[PDB]
Amino acid sequence: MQRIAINGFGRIGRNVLRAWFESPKQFHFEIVAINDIADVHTLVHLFKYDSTHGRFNGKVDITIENEKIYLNIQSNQRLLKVEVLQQKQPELLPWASLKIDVVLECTGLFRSHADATRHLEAGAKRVIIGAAPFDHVDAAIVYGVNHADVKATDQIISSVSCTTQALVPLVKIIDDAFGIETALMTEIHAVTADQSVLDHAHRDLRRARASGQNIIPTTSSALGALKRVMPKMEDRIDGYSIRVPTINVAAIDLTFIAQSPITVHHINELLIKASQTDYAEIMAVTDEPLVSSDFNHSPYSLIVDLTQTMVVGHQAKVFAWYDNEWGYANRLLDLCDSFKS
Amino acid sequence: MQRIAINGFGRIGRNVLRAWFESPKQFHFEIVAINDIADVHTLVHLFKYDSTHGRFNGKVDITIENEKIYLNIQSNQRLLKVEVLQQKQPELLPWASLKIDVVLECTGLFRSHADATRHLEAGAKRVIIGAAPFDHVDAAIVYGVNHADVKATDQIISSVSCTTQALVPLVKIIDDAFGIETALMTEIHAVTADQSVLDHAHRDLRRARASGQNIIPTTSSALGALKRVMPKMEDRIDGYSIRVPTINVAAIDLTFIAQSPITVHHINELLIKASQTDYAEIMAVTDEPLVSSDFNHSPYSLIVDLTQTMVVGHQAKVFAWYDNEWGYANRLLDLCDSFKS
Amino acid sequence: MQRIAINGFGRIGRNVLRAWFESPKQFHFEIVAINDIADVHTLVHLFKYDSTHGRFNGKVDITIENEKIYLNIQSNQRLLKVEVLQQKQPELLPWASLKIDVVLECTGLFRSHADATRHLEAGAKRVIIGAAPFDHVDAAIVYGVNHADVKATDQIISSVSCTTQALVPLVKIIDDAFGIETALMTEIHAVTADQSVLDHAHRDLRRARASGQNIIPTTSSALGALKRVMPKMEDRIDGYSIRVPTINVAAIDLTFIAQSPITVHHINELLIKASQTDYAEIMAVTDEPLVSSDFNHSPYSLIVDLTQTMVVGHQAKVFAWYDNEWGYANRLLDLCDSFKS
Amino acid sequence: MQRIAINGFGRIGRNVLRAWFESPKQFHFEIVAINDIADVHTLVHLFKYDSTHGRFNGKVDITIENEKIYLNIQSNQRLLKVEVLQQKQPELLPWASLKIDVVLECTGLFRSHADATRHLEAGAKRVIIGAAPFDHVDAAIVYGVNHADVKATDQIISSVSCTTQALVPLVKIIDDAFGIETALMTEIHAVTADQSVLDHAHRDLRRARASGQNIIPTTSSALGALKRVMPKMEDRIDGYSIRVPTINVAAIDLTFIAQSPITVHHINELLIKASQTDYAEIMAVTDEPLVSSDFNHSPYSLIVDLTQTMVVGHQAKVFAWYDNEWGYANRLLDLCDSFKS
Ligand SMILES: NC(=O)c1ccc[n+]([C@@H]2O[C@H](COP(=O)([O-])OP(=O)(O)OC[C@H]3O[C@@H](n4cnc5c(N)ncnc54)[C@H](O)[C@@H]3O)[C@@H](O)[C@H]2O)c1
Ligand SMILES: NC(=O)c1ccc[n+]([C@@H]2O[C@H](COP(=O)([O-])OP(=O)(O)OC[C@H]3O[C@@H](n4cnc5c(N)ncnc54)[C@H](O)[C@@H]3O)[C@@H](O)[C@H]2O)c1
Ligand SMILES: NC(=O)c1ccc[n+]([C@@H]2O[C@H](COP(=O)([O-])OP(=O)(O)OC[C@H]3O[C@@H](n4cnc5c(N)ncnc54)[C@H](O)[C@@H]3O)[C@@H](O)[C@H]2O)c1
Ligand SMILES: NC(=O)c1ccc[n+]([C@@H]2O[C@H](COP(=O)([O-])OP(=O)(O)OC[C@H]3O[C@@H](n4cnc5c(N)ncnc54)[C@H](O)[C@@H]3O)[C@@H](O)[C@H]2O)c1
Structure with missing residues (x-):
């Protein structure tokens, strides 16, 4: 299935991962990686405990395998193994080896066409900028209004704002x-x-x-x-x-x-x-x-x-x-x- | 020199009294009474200590005569002696004795022309309902717009809302x-x-x-x-x-x-x-x-x-x-x- | 079953009912009536929507049967039919006819042994005061510490405070x-x-x-x-x-x-x-x-x-x-x- | 008299300068310079408008004399002319030139004896670290308790915390x-x-x-x-x-x-x-x-x-x-x- 990565494990990124586990309907894709400048222990803590949405109803375990850090996340009869990265420079991410179809860019810092492309350079096939466009995008999509107009050439997509x-x-x-x-x-x-x-x-x-x-x-x-x-x-x-x-x-x-x-x-x-x-x-x-x-x-x-x-x-x-x-x-x-x- | 009373010593009433003292323009009329269902000790405490506008910058003395209760208030080189009442039914107020020219009705509970008139019965010449009219008023006034449209015959006036x-x-x-x-x-x-x-x-x-x-x-x-x-x-x-x-x-x-x-x-x-x-x-x-x-x-x-x-x-x-x-x-x-x- | 009634449908009373419905293990007694001074539409609205604990995960339908007001509540594979009263004076409540075994006294106003006994006069067999004892009680109970000290003859019980x-x-x-x-x-x-x-x-x-x-x-x-x-x-x-x-x-x-x-x-x-x-x-x-x-x-x-x-x-x-x-x-x-x- | 500088114009830095103007006691020293990483316009805005302490009851005028930026401040019958700086590293600051007796170190970042001495390197005679010590200081002072114990040779002083x-x-x-x-x-x-x-x-x-x-x-x-x-x-x-x-x-x-x-x-x-x-x-x-x-x-x-x-x-x-x-x-x-x- 498709392989999604999350760049920026903030309000949006965390809630994206949470919403995956909580959805009544299982999604036909996996989240396989996340990246934040904060360390993994901080990210797991904020993932598990939320002042707004409450406790994640599930279990999270950190493993080190080879020299890579993974989260094993189990909830709602689903499990994800998710690699954790700590790279402030998107161009340096390993999207090529992780076979990333879609990056969700949720940092707020890479909204420009050029900045978003860094993920492409890193070998991801498609970026969704979780923000209004800054300069240019292939497409600006509101799900339920114009998501059918996405074409395979749309590589930089903005999902606009709340x-x-x-x-x-x-x-x-x-x-x-x-x-x-x-x-x-x-x-x-x-x-x-x-x-x-x-x-x-x-x-x-x-x-x-x-x-x-x-x-x-x-x-x-x-x-x-x-x-x-x-x-x-x-x-x-x-x-x-x-x-x-x-x-x-x-x-x-x-x-x-x-x-x-x-x-x-x-x-x-x-x-x-x-x-x-x-x-x-x-x-x-x-x-x-x-x-x-x-x-x-x-x-x-x-x-x-x-x-x-x-x-x-x-x-x-x-x-x-x-x-x-x-x-x-x-x-x-x-x-x-x-x-x- | 007119004689104002305040009925309801809450956010508006207390602030009216404060604003009289703090105004850089000295007003001509005097505030000479206040009424509330709460006792004078509670009233003076809340007049002095305000979570919103801070500590009252002046001196409040409570005086108990055989019968009557007065505040003596000094601030910004002004002094008022203010009779304090505790009467839930405004008709039973002694506005006649007190020669009240204007009552400021700041309780929120006496907006009907009927209820406002309870103060006229108790001896006041004029009432300003400190809210939107509930039904009839002789005039609804916004100071700086139609304050001149007040007629010397008008008795039940509304100063509408903020x-x-x-x-x-x-x-x-x-x-x-x-x-x-x-x-x-x-x-x-x-x-x-x-x-x-x-x-x-x-x-x-x-x-x-x-x-x-x-x-x-x-x-x-x-x-x-x-x-x-x-x-x-x-x-x-x-x-x-x-x-x-x-x-x-x-x-x-x-x-x-x-x-x-x-x-x-x-x-x-x-x-x-x-x-x-x-x-x-x-x-x-x-x-x-x-x-x-x-x-x-x-x-x-x-x-x-x-x-x-x-x-x-x-x-x-x-x-x-x-x-x-x-x-x-x-x-x-x-x-x-x-x-x- | 045993038959419980709630007096006062506030923060505590409303949460008692919700908690009945949400407990993983089902309680083997029923809540058969609630009383409050507010009207039933206000009660049902506050029961369904909660700023603190979220929406009630269930359905509530109001019915009139005889001259009696009922809540039909469905949640978590459980159903209760709950009579709604609006009687400010507990001696007047119909506990005899409802065959109430326990009243939960959750108003804050009937903490004295005398005030609480009014529910017994109305025909309830036992009262738990959901507050600290005011003057006297047959037993003051902390569940998990001394609830086994409750005597069959005990009729006015305090469950103390949180x-x-x-x-x-x-x-x-x-x-x-x-x-x-x-x-x-x-x-x-x-x-x-x-x-x-x-x-x-x-x-x-x-x-x-x-x-x-x-x-x-x-x-x-x-x-x-x-x-x-x-x-x-x-x-x-x-x-x-x-x-x-x-x-x-x-x-x-x-x-x-x-x-x-x-x-x-x-x-x-x-x-x-x-x-x-x-x-x-x-x-x-x-x-x-x-x-x-x-x-x-x-x-x-x-x-x-x-x-x-x-x-x-x-x-x-x-x-x-x-x-x-x-x-x-x-x-x-x-x-x-x-x-x- | 004596010449003070503030490094860091945050909650503390800003209130020190305000407190200077507002004090009933007039102080026998002048604040002659401030430094922050933020631009002068932001700084003056936040000095004038405070969500906690309200509006500064005074006037501030920014001038440029030579290539130096200054604030002309007037409040409570008192005046200061304060040079504004924007240097991220303390050793670079012009304390020697400005003839600084005391730097108030209020960034939260230069609490070590070494980082603090950077100001002495810059030509300041004395630093007060406006925070608990990190490692060593010449003196940890609570005003009104042990401030008499400051030696004329003490150069790196901590004023501890609130x-x-x-x-x-x-x-x-x-x-x-x-x-x-x-x-x-x-x-x-x-x-x-x-x-x-x-x-x-x-x-x-x-x-x-x-x-x-x-x-x-x-x-x-x-x-x-x-x-x-x-x-x-x-x-x-x-x-x-x-x-x-x-x-x-x-x-x-x-x-x-x-x-x-x-x-x-x-x-x-x-x-x-x-x-x-x-x-x-x-x-x-x-x-x-x-x-x-x-x-x-x-x-x-x-x-x-x-x-x-x-x-x-x-x-x-x-x-x-x-x-x-x-x-x-x-x-x-x-x-x-x-x-x-
Ligand atoms: N929260 C909302 O209501 C909402 C709605 C729609 C869109 N958005 C947008 O989502 C974006 C993120 O907002 P948020 O509320 O999640 O903010 P946030 O501050 O919670 O998220 C930012 C996260 O990115 C991380 N980060 C920062 N620099 C990084 C880097 N170089 N590489 C990797 N990770 C990095 C931070 O450590 C943090 O976890 C913004 O563009 C915002 O407009 C937010
Ligand atoms: N607060 C605002 O921003 C604002 C602005 C404009 C107009 N108003 C209006 O001013 C009125 C009062 O509002 P407030 O914010 O001062 O409310 P408040 O609750 O602070 O004031 C009500 C006061 O009336 C007293 N009171 C109650 N029953 C009384 C009685 N029978 N006799 C005398 N006093 C009695 C209460 O003890 C209390 O001090 C309302 O009509 C309100 O809509 C309020
Ligand atoms: N809320 C807490 O955290 C907490 C915890 C433990 C104990 N308690 C105690 O529980 C009691 C209730 O407090 P609460 O937080 O539920 O308050 P609340 O104000 O939310 O509940 C009071 C309810 O009683 C109703 N009521 C008023 N007069 C009534 C009457 N004569 N007959 C019937 N119902 C009437 C009100 O309309 C309201 O619904 C208090 O004694 C409180 O100290 C509260
Ligand atoms: N506010 C309190 O209640 C309180 C009381 C006692 C002690 N303290 C301590 O005071 C220190 C500062 O606290 P605050 O509340 O004033 O913080 P703040 O975050 O409001 O202010 C810090 C300021 O320093 C500036 N700054 C950052 N790096 C700088 C640099 N290199 N050069 C110059 N300016 C720089 C920032 O732009 C900001 O204006 C902390 O150590 C804090 O623990 C605070």
């Missing part, structure tokens, strides 16, 4: 049915790994500020990314993100001008229908009075909160939740599974 | 310059006194949930209230509020459809000129990369973050911060000071 | 092995339901204070409680609790003077042996560097953290974790199960 | 009056800048875990530092630190065995008397029902909470609060002032 995987379906479903003149996105997002505990020097002066204390407005990569998947939306959408002191789960607030008559009732019926048919793999809709923690560990790319839909004149707002870690992780698995042979 | 006091200026300023077809508000708000520590039974199933752990979408009274202050915008505005785990300070995100040509530059230029002329009392504008904490203890009704301004087609989004406790409290005092002859 | 169910085993084990001259406890505890979101009037001026913003030292009922369970330890142990901004899980820091030679090694070995033999049902020991969230949803009364153990001379500190909600709730069900068996 | 400056007075006073056989310390501490936002690789597997979600036991440097100030206490004292989700302020809980008769009353009288005489510069005592936020921006090294004092037999516990940032910063300024003699 935010994009939620925004893109909403925009598409709604634009397809009612037509969107323009739209503006407000995201309300849990804290991220790159924020600060206390006020501290940082590249961004807002993300420098104490994350547990502040409401922090910041930029979002999701708009640039959406425009690469839907170029027709150029100059028709913008937005930003707001970090707030929760550990996980985010929401998108999308405000649009419709090109045809809208009611709350019709918007919701459209989204329900979308969720039951074409987008059932990735989208749910709820009518219950729920809050962020209710969607922690949810595998959906988005869960529309139909109770928040509002219309005034031609202007509407819709609202969807997502687990920004578990949704994304599951979509990386789904995406890999879609490559088939 | 949210309203920020929404209305924005909507007014933008409607007057560009025209607003429709607008939709997203408020991102610190937790409030009525929320829950842990998941607990509550009249509102969203506010029942742990306030420190969750992003919580909920209703805003601001929209109902804005209709009263500006009935020309009936059915043109809607919105909601999101609670997040910060202790204080909020932001409004207003997305509108303009009726004439707009750019980021033009919108900002207008908001700047407004803050420098007609609205300099209640409004500021910044371009510095700030976050919620930086507005704690700010007395402004709103501070526009101009770097957040966005335009797509006929649609735009503006963003303003406000201290939901300190701005409102200052606006109550400003309102009381407007009644002066 | 803190007590952790402290008592620790003291008993160390005292039996090395002897305790004296000991002092510091508990670090997540926020509880009776605290405040913002600074607010309260009967206790420390629990008045914003629970998300502060370290708040307060009293504990566990020292009084331990005295009832182990009278020899009168005048030998004291302590207190600190509330900190986490949502669940606590720790005991116990400092004791030993009456015989001690080392870190010998203390940890003892605690381990105890957890593997006599205390296996309620006690675990870990050697890994774990934090509070790693014990969320743990059913143990205590998990000793052997990395924390310190000795200087004759003085020693031990440290144990517990899920204050889930442990206690499991112990309630274990206690009920003990009467049957 | 925790050390609260613990040492407590230990000394109690040991002096009553004799301490042994003692154990539990510190309850706000989060610190080296902690994690989310679960992230870290040298310390505990400090790896999400800082806003968890109670986190970890090591304290204070025991090693205290044994350098009081070698007699070797083998007689140990302890640790628990990090909890607050932004600032900590407490020490000291459990000790007394060598002579003790009561609560006598321990409290002692600590009170100490605070009023020989420790009046650094120590206070309160019996008010206060919480962490009430000691934010307190300049004391420790504030004893006398209500927390417990005695059982020969064992006692005391409790003291401190602002871990603002206390230490003031003690740094106080130590520099002591060198004028």
Whole structure:
């Protein structure tokens, strides 16, 4: 079967591996290697114990065989033997000897076409950048929207961002049915790994500020990314993100001008229908009075909160939740599974 | 020289009293009484020691006469003697004896014209409900917008909500310059006194949930209230509020459809000129990369973050911060000071 | 079976019901009624969605049959039909007709022997007060330490507190092995339901204070409680609790003077042996560097953290974790199960 | 007079410069230079805007005179002109040219005697290491305890840690009056800048875990530092630190065995008397029902909470609060002032 490697064993990388074991349906590929600059004992500890998603429900054993380090991981009636590497320079990875079909690049540091190619140079056949593109990519994929357009020549694929995987379906479903003149996105997002505990020097002066204390407005990569998947939306959408002191789960607030008559009732019926048919793999809709923690560990790319839909004149707002870690992780698995042979 | 009383000595009431002392402008009226169901010792302790605004910078003496109880408060070279009451039923209050010109109704429990009138029965001349009207009021006021529309005959007045006091200026300023077809508000708000520590039974199933752990979408009274202050915008505005785990300070995100040509530059230029002329009392504008904490203890009704301004087609989004406790409290005092002859 | 009822469907009562459903081994008694002052739609909503313990992994359907309200709950191959009451006065509850064998008193309001006897008046055969004794009880019980002391004639039983169910085993084990001259406890505890979101009037001026913003030292009922369970330890142990901004899980820091030679090694070995033999049902020991969230949803009364153990001379500190909600709730069900068996 | 420089403009460096402006006492020395790896704009931003201590009540102007960058700072009727540097390696700094009497080494990185001497190599006469010693120092000083013991020839001084400056007075006073056989310390501490936002690789597997979600036991440097100030206490004292989700302020809980008769009353009288005489510069005592936020921006090294004092037999516990940032910063300024003699 396909052989996947993970580069960067962080929030995303770890959750990717966890989600593999937890999936109700076994995936027709294996994760055979991981790479991080941190040492193996640190990685196994963080893999096993998570403040957000709880204890890994399984067993992990470190072995040294030849001069190589492996994890033997057993859970949910599955076992993976996974080689562990510690190489800060992607070009030096052994992807050639490990026969790596797909690298998931989850470090945040190799988003450029050139940087991503280092894995190719190392002998991997395909990279998925687990982030919005920086400059160029062969393809920008949202699973469940355009994963069928991947061609065998697409070697550098971006799986965009949590935010994009939620925004893109909403925009598409709604634009397809009612037509969107323009739209503006407000995201309300849990804290991220790159924020600060206390006020501290940082590249961004807002993300420098104490994350547990502040409401922090910041930029979002999701708009640039959406425009690469839907170029027709150029100059028709913008937005930003707001970090707030929760550990996980985010929401998108999308405000649009419709090109045809809208009611709350019709918007919701459209989204329900979308969720039951074409987008059932990735989208749910709820009518219950729920809050962020209710969607922690949810595998959906988005869960529309139909109770928040509002219309005034031609202007509407819709609202969807997502687990920004578990949704994304599951979509990386789904995406890999879609490559088939 | 008017005589103000405060009913409900909570986040708003205490802050009103503090703001009187801390104001660089000395007000003409005196605060001469306060009432709460809690005893004076609890009241003075919470007045002195505040988790949000810090230690009160002054001296509080409690005096027990045969009958009456008084605080003697000294700070910033000002002195008040303040009778303290403990009467749950506002009709039984001795406002007649005390010659109360204005009661500030800060309990959250007496917003109906009926309930507000309990203070008129107890002997007060005028009541300012410190919230959105529940049904009828002689006037709904946003200081710095329609405070002159108060008639010397008006007895039951509403100072609406913090949210309203920020929404209305924005909507007014933008409607007057560009025209607003429709607008939709997203408020991102610190937790409030009525929320829950842990998941607990509550009249509102969203506010029942742990306030420190969750992003919580909920209703805003601001929209109902804005209709009263500006009935020309009936059915043109809607919105909601999101609670997040910060202790204080909020932001409004207003997305509108303009009726004439707009750019980021033009919108900002207008908001700047407004803050420098007609609205300099209640409004500021910044371009510095700030976050919620930086507005704690700010007395402004709103501070526009101009770097957040966005335009797509006929649609735009503006963003303003406000201290939901300190701005409102200052606006109550400003309102009381407007009644002066 | 035996027939249990829960009085007060809060953090404890709701977790008791959940724990009934989640226990790997099925309990051989049924929960047949719950009572609370909140309406049934609020109860069912909070039972299904939990900020701390996640979604209930099952289905709940409300039915009206006669004039009676029922919950039909399905989870883990198990079914209960549970009558819902809403009676603020326990003497008025229909325990006679429901043939209640045990009431779990989980409101915090009926801890006195008199208050608790009201359930007996209503026709229940036995009450467990899910709190420290207020004045008198027939028995004060720590499951796993002295639950075999319950007499057939005992009708008002205290299951003490979470803190007590952790402290008592620790003291008993160390005292039996090395002897305790004296000991002092510091508990670090997540926020509880009776605290405040913002600074607010309260009967206790420390629990008045914003629970998300502060370290708040307060009293504990566990020292009084331990005295009832182990009278020899009168005048030998004291302590207190600190509330900190986490949502669940606590720790005991116990400092004791030993009456015989001690080392870190010998203390940890003892605690381990105890957890593997006599205390296996309620006690675990870990050697890994774990934090509070790693014990969320743990059913143990205590998990000793052997990395924390310190000795200087004759003085020693031990440290144990517990899920204050889930442990206690499991112990309630274990206690009920003990009467049957 | 005397010329100070700050190496590292973080929580400590920044608060030292703020504390300089805010001190009621005007200090007989000037801060004439700061160095950080971050650019001047970030530094000035973080000096002006603080999530913990609020906005600097003053003005800062950046000028470029020659090719040198300077901050013109004005606050509290006082002025400084501070050169800004951006050198990653201390030996390169221009201390000789600038005529630096004392460098405050606040990076956390140059705590070895060797790394510290790099500043003396750079032309500084004296370094204070603003942290516990790594290997050797000429003197480990707790201001208000042993600062008289600095020799004019001492060149590499440690001002220990925040925790050390609260613990040492407590230990000394109690040991002096009553004799301490042994003692154990539990510190309850706000989060610190080296902690994690989310679960992230870290040298310390505990400090790896999400800082806003968890109670986190970890090591304290204070025991090693205290044994350098009081070698007699070797083998007689140990302890640790628990990090909890607050932004600032900590407490020490000291459990000790007394060598002579003790009561609560006598321990409290002692600590009170100490605070009023020989420790009046650094120590206070309160019996008010206060919480962490009430000691934010307190300049004391420790504030004893006398209500927390417990005695059982020969064992006692005391409790003291401190602002871990603002206390230490003031003690740094106080130590520099002591060198004028
Ligand atoms: N977390 C989310 O909600 C979310 C959602 C969508 C996309 N993303 C993206 O995922 C990426 C990673 O974010 P995260 O939250 O997992 O962050 P993280 O900081 O938890 O992960 C970074 C990891 O990479 C490792 N690493 C750093 N440099 C390395 C190198 N040179 N070689 C190998 N390993 C290296 C680090 O040790 C760490 O384990 C970012 O690009 C982020 O935008 C995150
Ligand atoms: N907090 C904000 O940011 C904000 C801003 C604008 C308006 N408001 C409004 O201000 C009002 C009060 O809100 P708050 O945040 O001060 O709440 P709070 O809970 O802090 O204040 C309520 C106070 O009223 C007292 N009280 C209760 N019953 C009483 C009675 N029968 N008689 C007298 N006092 C009684 C309570 O003891 C308490 O001190 C509400 O209408 C709220 O919507 C709040
Ligand atoms: N939560 C813990 O960590 C913990 C652990 C051990 C013991 N306890 C004890 O258990 C008790 C309950 O605390 P909790 O955390 O579940 O609190 P909670 O506030 O979550 O639960 C109280 C519940 O009782 C209901 N109630 C109120 N009045 C009632 C009445 N007259 N009749 C029936 N129901 C009524 C409330 O509506 C609410 O559902 C307290 O005595 C507490 O000290 C709590
Ligand atoms: N904050 C506290 O509560 C406290 C109290 C006592 C002691 N300390 C100790 O003080 C030290 C620093 O702590 P902090 O909280 O101020 O940390 P911080 O991380 O907030 O500040 C460190 C600063 O040093 C700068 N820096 C890094 N490398 C540098 C270099 N080579 N040259 C110049 N600047 C450099 C960083 O950019 C940053 O501004 C640590 O040893 C800490 O343990 C902290």
